[PDB]
UniProtKB/Swiss-Prot annotation:
This is Cyclotide hyen-D. GO terms for biological process: cytolysis in another organism; defense response; hemolysis in another organism. It holds the Pfam family Cyclotide. There is a cross-link at G1-N30 (Cyclopeptide (Gly-Asn)). Probably participates in a plant defense mechanism. Has strong cytotoxic activity against HUVEC cells (LC(50)= 0.58 uM) and various cancer cells including HeLa (LC(50)= 0.48 uM), MCF-7 and K562. Also displays some hemolytic activity. Binds to and induces leakage in phospholipd membranes, particularly ones containing 1-palmitoyl-2-oleophosphatidylethanolamine (POPE). InterPro entries: Cyclotide, Cyclotide_bracelet_CS, Cyclotide_sf. Belongs to the cyclotide family. Bracelet subfamily. Detected in stems (at protein level). The keyword RNA-binding does not apply.
Length: 30
């Protein structure tokens, strides 16, 4: 629920393969 410092508007969260989750086209981790 807290932004990783990445986005996924156009390009998914590379950090989503770790612990982030694209959420509202921003990467939110928990």
């Amino acid at each position: 629920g807290f932004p990783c410092g990445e986005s996924c508007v156009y390009i998914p969260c590379f950090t989503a393969a770790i612990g982030c989750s694209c959420k509202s086209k921003v990467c939110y981790k928990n």
